[PDB]
Design a protein around this ligand. Structure first.
Ligand SMILES: *[C@@H]1O[C@H](CO)[C@@H](O[C@@H]2O[C@H](CO)[C@@H](O)[C@H](O)[C@H]2NC(C)=O)[C@H](O)[C@H]1NC(C)=O
Ligand SMILES: *[C@H]1O[C@H](CO)[C@@H](O)[C@H](O)[C@H]1NC(C)=O
Ligand SMILES: CC(=O)OCC[N+](C)(C)C
Lengths: 102, 83, 82, 128, 31
């Protein structure tokens, strides 16, 4: 809470929080590098195509961006081409066939 | 309320009241706290959740000897309402 | 409004929100209370609860929050956090 | 020496967010209003409640926050937290759940010439 | 930690969380 942070907001928030509300600590190196890894519950809006239900495939998106800073003052870059699923808990109802960040 | 303002200033600013410390002369002493409960209304008892919802008023009484004053010296004030 | 800034600084220099706002502690604070019912949200017959949306208008005089408008550029009213 | 820091100190060293931005008490502040609906979440008919996601854009002039880019290295926009500036305090009056304000308190953008813009998002549950 | 206490006091003596954390305003914060 004491430092400047980027104001990332979930554009397609449906009925949750738009921004980060759980302000966990940042790790600061002597070089000024900051790593901040807050948690969040994203309640995003997804168009659910029910045509093949219960054999249906869905494509749920999460659009994230700095709300009040444009690209000329703050630039966001993906850490990797894909979301990190290393700690993902297995779902008893869904299988993630694909995942990608653009 | 010149008198209530003066009394509050005397009790808290002048004497240096510290709300973090208990009202005791020595640490080994204990503070007597008397409790009573008034049931305003029994809202519900949910069986599936096994939960009782009640509206209660909790009457607390204790003594804080740091908050003592002689009323005649402060316009015969006998009681104060404080946050 | 520089006048309002100076006014608010003066009004809350030695102000106490704990103390009742009249000149003598033997005097009573006179409060006018009015209720505005905006909506009757729901009647719960099981738990016997009526939920309503209301506005609770409260009017009273604060003795220590007076000023002369001429000394503050004609400012006759201000908005203050409750 | 970041010029944003100098501009911020110039604009906010002596500034009262409690007072309206009017030179006289009898002047009126004009607020240019825009409401952008991004999604109609639902209409719950049992509770008679419309849930919508919007952005409330409000623009106005604050003469106290007036600055020229030439005096501050060409800065044309400064982002500051909305709590540091006066706001008109726009609320949804016909809300049903008691939530009057916006969902996320975004920064205000202060443009040269004293132009303040605020575009927070909001989830509103309104009576219908 | 006395060293970390002193460092934390020093870092936030004249710190501002309002402006973007760049030496020059024409630089872009890379996130
Ligand atoms: C912000 O300041 C500038 C001046 O730097 C104001 O522009 C002036 O507008 C007036 C007429 O009202 C002219 O006579 C001037 O020539 C302009 N500038 C100068 C330097 O004289 C501008 O109006 C201000 N914005 C406000 C008041 O919000
Ligand atoms: C308290 O002091 C006042 C002023 O001396 C006196 O008139 C009054 O009788 C005293 N006692 C009470 C109970 O008011
Ligand atoms: C400047 C500002 O607050 O803009 C918010 C809207 N957005 C994220 C689409 C640009």
């Amino acid at each position: 809470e004491k430092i400047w942070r980027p104001d990332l907001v979930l554009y397609n928030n449906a009925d949750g929080d738009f921004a980060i509300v759980k302000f966990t600590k940042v790790l600061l190196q002597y070089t000024g590098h900051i790593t901040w890894t807050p948690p969040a519950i994203f309640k995003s809006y997804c168009e659910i195509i029910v045509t093949h239900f219960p054999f249906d495939e869905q494509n749920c998106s999460m659009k994230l961006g700095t709300w009040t800073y444009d690209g000329s003052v703050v630039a966001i870059n993906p850490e990797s081409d894909q979301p990190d699923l290393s700690n993902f808990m297995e779902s008893g109802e869904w299988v993630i066939k694909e995942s990608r960040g653009w | 309320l010149n008198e209530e303002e003066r009394l509050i200033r005397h009790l808290f600013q002048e004497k240096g009241y510290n709300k973090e410390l208990r009202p005791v002369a020595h640490k080994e002493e204990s503070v007597d706290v008397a409790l009573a409960l008034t049931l305003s209304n029994l809202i519900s008892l949910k069986e599936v959740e096994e939960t009782l919802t009640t509206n209660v008023w909790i009457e607390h009484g204790w003594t804080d000897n740091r908050l003592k004053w002689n009323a005649e010296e402060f316009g015969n004030i006998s009681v104060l309402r404080l946050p | 409004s520089e006048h309002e800034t100076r006014l608010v600084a003066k009004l809350f220099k030695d102000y106490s929100s704990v103390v009742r706002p009249v000149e003598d502690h033997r005097q009573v604070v006179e409060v006018t209370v009015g209720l505005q019912l905006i909506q009757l949200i729901n009647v719960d017959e099981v738990n016997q609860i009526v939920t309503t949306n209301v506005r609770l208008k409260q009017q009273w005089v604060d003795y220590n929050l007076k000023w002369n408008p001429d000394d503050y550029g004609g400012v006759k009213k201000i908005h203050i956090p409750s | 020496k970041n010029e944003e820091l100098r501009l911020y100190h110039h604009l906010f060293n002596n500034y009262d967010p409690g007072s309206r931005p009017v030179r006289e008490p009898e002047d009126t502040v004009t607020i240019s209003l825009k409401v952008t609906l991004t999604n109609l979440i639902s209409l719950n008919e049992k509770e008679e409640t419309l849930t919508t996601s919007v952005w409330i854009g409000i623009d106005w002039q604050d003469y106290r926050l007036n600055y020229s880019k030439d005096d501050f290295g060409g800065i044309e926009t400064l982002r500051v937290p909305s709590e540091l500036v006066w706001l008109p305090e726009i609320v949804l009056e016909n809300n049903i759940d008691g939530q009057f304000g916006v969902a996320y308190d975004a920064n205000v953008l202060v443009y040269e010439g004293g132009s303040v813009t605020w575009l927070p998002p909001a989830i509103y549950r309104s009576v219908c």
